[PDB]
Amino acid sequence: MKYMITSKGDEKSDLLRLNMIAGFGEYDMEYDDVEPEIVISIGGDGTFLSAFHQYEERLDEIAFIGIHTGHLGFYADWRPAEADKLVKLLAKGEYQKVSYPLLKTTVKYGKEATYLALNESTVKSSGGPFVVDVVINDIHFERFRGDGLCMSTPSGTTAYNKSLGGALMHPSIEAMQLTEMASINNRVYRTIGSPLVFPKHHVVSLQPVNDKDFQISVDHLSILHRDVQEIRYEVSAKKIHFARFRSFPFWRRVHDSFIED
Amino acid sequence: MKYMITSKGDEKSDLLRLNMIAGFGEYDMEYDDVEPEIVISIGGDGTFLSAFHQYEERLDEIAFIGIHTGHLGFYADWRPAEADKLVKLLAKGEYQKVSYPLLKTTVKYGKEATYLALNESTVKSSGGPFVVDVVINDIHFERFRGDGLCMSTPSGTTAYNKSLGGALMHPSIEAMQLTEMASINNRVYRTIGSPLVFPKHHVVSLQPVNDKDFQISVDHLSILHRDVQEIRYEVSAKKIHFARFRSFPFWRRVHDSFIED
Amino acid sequence: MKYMITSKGDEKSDLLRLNMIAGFGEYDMEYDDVEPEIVISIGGDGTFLSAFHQYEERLDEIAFIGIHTGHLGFYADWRPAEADKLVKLLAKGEYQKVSYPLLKTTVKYGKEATYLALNESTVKSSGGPFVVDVVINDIHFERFRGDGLCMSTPSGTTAYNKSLGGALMHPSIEAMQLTEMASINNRVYRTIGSPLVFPKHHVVSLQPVNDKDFQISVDHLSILHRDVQEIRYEVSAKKIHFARFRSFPFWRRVHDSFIED
Amino acid sequence: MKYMITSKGDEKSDLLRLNMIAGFGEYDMEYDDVEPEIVISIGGDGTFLSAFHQYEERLDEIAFIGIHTGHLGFYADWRPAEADKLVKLLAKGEYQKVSYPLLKTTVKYGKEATYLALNESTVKSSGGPFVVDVVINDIHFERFRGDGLCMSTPSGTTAYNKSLGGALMHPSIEAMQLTEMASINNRVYRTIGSPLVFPKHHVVSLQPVNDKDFQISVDHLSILHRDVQEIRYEVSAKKIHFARFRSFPFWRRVHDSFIED
């Protein structure tokens, strides 16, 4: 099939990439970085996040593989030594695919712009204080004042979501999780405090009250949006598909990353 | 159909119960507290929890209704004024049923005993320090030392789980959530810290290392178990069925209970 | 004595200010906004913070008073109705003074710039990731990666510090408190997690490792510093002096602000 | 001077104890376990806590030393290899003493009983729910419902207090810190949430409202008190005196214990 390989850029990743292409060369495998069916990421989770967004418009025609040259990642969870063993099983085929849920973000102006996130999407204070109205399925849930909010995919719960006190969710759960960044809670302002886990079809809407500029981030892409009036969060109908070749369970990936490998 | 009504016991609850039975008397409705199809709880969530466990062996043949005489509850979410309106719609039928997931607990000795929880099941220090090995789908995940652990149903996440830093989960999500009670984390002991959200079929096993006595609780039932060697947690295959007669969404119930009614 | 009055600017604050000046006019009191001995703030804590920094170079020659026209504040803790009673006791004299500790921030370049904070001073990510080395009395304590850090005065612990999980400290304690903003903790990065309470003479130093630009804030003043190599935190030798005229204890101020007035 | 040595009891601690007594034998040093001036603890912090309470009635006539045979402790912070070097400097004298603050607990019945804590004193649910009124300097601050409360000395903030979210306090600060154990916070019940740091002379009083039985703990001593009506917490006037022979600063002890030795 068509394949391509992206690299962190350092000497170790570029050289493992050149060795896999060489191993791939002796097969019915064509390197193609326009319409690949297999996207291999060599580096870290950030390298994988770049690879995902590089091909977010062909998600249903692509299986992703992550190779970590540094420490173990959650998307780059195969080490370099098995790359030669990886070439072989990628060549024949015959491998199950694993699908993780994604988060859809809709940003409306006064036109709109949608985005797709693998880790999380965050909304932040543009310069002055951050006050937004939180609306859940068209019901006003709370008026939030603080540093910002974070809406996380299941696989993203080990990322920014974990640092904000969120729960770690197994990626087979089609859900999204909202966490607060340093909220005020006094006699004037009241927020729920706890992280909120939303299922499919539930729409969380963030609406400004005073300022209308915000720092909106989607994974590592962070741009300041102007003249916004709504940020809609929703479990996407699209999924990211991983090529699977042996059992590396999620809770084991959590154990190795946070307890001790 | 067969029905029965349980009461908190105070003057207000006993009298609303006697008025609903009177309203029920003028219908094709027989009061029966052995094999009811409709179980009405008058009082609070605790009164409802008692009503659930009173009939946990006929869960698939029962629809539950909760009436709160005091503050708003999450299971007792209809106020007394609509009880007369409640009698009518219960009499004809024609009402959708709502199903919430339950948590199954298995306790093994050296025989075994299983239990069913609507809120949560907790395991606690029997007197000396609490040390248990946490095993997820037969993999050793961590060695926990602290005050105890709490495994919560979705509808239970607003109860004890919320006080322990857990996330609030919408009850349509078939899952269970584990939270820590005051764990030690130093160079010797290491725990994940974050709450963990597990899907169906995932089995969390708690295994003792030193002492084998524990305070195990299931909802308000808390008994000390002796000579245990395993506590297994798992999303139950059974569900609790609620009689539904109008839209009182979960996130609104959360708003009214924690933000301001 | 010399006095001056600052106002939030709205109609209510400007008019209470004009009435106190009128009441002050019938006394041996001269309005002077260059070298006052009494600085009255009318509005909120933010109005008081502006009044403090407006006169931070004459702290030992000034007693501060706060009047809240809106909700109760921690520095603006007298309501408008007692302003006429306030005029009288300010005129005669004979009132004890209360002193709260301040936080000193030193920012070095490659010259230096020092600052004085009543609430807190925070250091934040300038655009890229935030990584700093934390040094306590010239010992390397930890390498922090996250959103930022917050060093709070005692009276500031109810402000930003409280939202970040810090402890509330009685202002008679000459100390400063450091809290983390969303830190990463995995096999690579390790931070203490808990808030740290430092006494007098203890110097906490923040040193960059990669980027050298930071968003440094001091109370509501937030400016981006360039080419920094050290941010030093230390309990200041200066104190803010409040004019006291009746007992409004701190823990009562906490109760009224966060429990219910 | 008079001295004595206590041991964890295992083979390693008993044998290091017998070697120090031998080294002590060749000096103007008399082993005396009734009125020692030097109390050496060999084992861990728990062994040291037992040694402190064994002599809490002669605190002002005793200097304490801790030797850790296992991992590094906060009171047992010298390793066995320097015990022979420890014998010499203990023999001559000429060493500064370090003093840490203690926490005084008063428990009243309907007579009273006072206690002294080096780490913390906790109050817990006796069997039924835990509800107490929190009173600060004779003002009603809050009505707490939850698992319990913990009042910690400065040196105790790295113990149970740290697991409950409290701040780490340098032991030169004469203070005490209160933290909550899993409190309920809804429209009915309201607690401050944040840890509270109290100075000298401040009296925190816990008063029951419904049940009057409680599990009160002081360090590792935990006994159930009956017919109580008040638990008073206060920074003690007594201090524990440590024999100091080189610089092992507190924040370094924190670094080595929680970051990495």
Ligand SMILES: CN(CC#Cc1nc2c(N)ncnc2n1[C@@H]1O[C@H](CO)[C@@H](O)[C@H]1OP(=O)(O)O)C[C@H]1O[C@@H](n2cnc3c(N)ncnc32)[C@H](O)[C@@H]1O
């Ligand atoms: C440049 N990164 C790429 C990546 C990744 C990333 N994704 C995940 C994930 N899904 N589960 C766990 N670990 C993850 N990683 C690691 O996390 C660190 C920060 O990159 C790195 O070790 C990553 O690892 P690797 O790239 O060094 O191999 C942007 C991301 O950073 C997250 N993020 C931002 N701010 C904070 C913060 N304050 N605290 C914690 N996380 C934060 C956020 O989610 C964003 O998408």
Ligand SMILES: CN(CC#Cc1nc2c(N)ncnc2n1[C@@H]1O[C@H](CO)[C@@H](O)[C@H]1OP(=O)(O)O)C[C@H]1O[C@@H](n2cnc3c(N)ncnc32)[C@H](O)[C@@H]1O
């Ligand atoms: C006697 N109760 C019955 C009930 C209920 C209960 N269930 C829920 C729920 N699912 N979502 C939210 N609120 C809930 N409620 C309320 O919670 C308080 C404590 O009953 C009361 O107001 C309840 O309300 P109502 O009875 O006064 O109307 C035992 C339960 O207490 C929980 N629990 C135990 N210890 C703690 C603690 N330390 N912190 C918080 N919750 C705790 C635990 O889950 C247990 O099953």
Ligand SMILES: CN(CC#Cc1nc2c(N)ncnc2n1[C@@H]1O[C@H](CO)[C@@H](O)[C@H]1OP(=O)(O)O)C[C@H]1O[C@@H](n2cnc3c(N)ncnc32)[C@H](O)[C@@H]1O
């Ligand atoms: C514009 N403010 C002025 C003030 C004041 C301020 N100081 C204090 C204080 N010492 N103890 C308690 N309450 C305080 N207040 C209130 O706090 C809210 C935010 O102003 C307002 O109600 C204040 O009240 P009043 O102005 O509406 O009357 C900047 C400050 O905001 C703090 N701050 C910034 N970001 C956050 C955040 N994410 N969460 C919580 N606090 C934050 C920070 O400390 C900064 O100095």
Ligand SMILES: CN(CC#Cc1nc2c(N)ncnc2n1[C@@H]1O[C@H](CO)[C@@H](O)[C@H]1OP(=O)(O)O)C[C@H]1O[C@@H](n2cnc3c(N)ncnc32)[C@H](O)[C@@H]1O
């Ligand atoms: C039997 N212990 C003796 C000791 C000591 C103790 N004191 C301190 C301290 N001041 N600073 C930091 N570390 C400390 N240690 C360690 O802490 C662990 C638990 O002993 C052990 O490693 C201790 O170490 P060492 O004995 O193995 O060498 C009772 C104490 O346990 C604390 N405690 C109780 N319950 C919990 C909990 N749920 N979480 C955390 N701490 C708890 C409480 O404070 C009590 O006085």
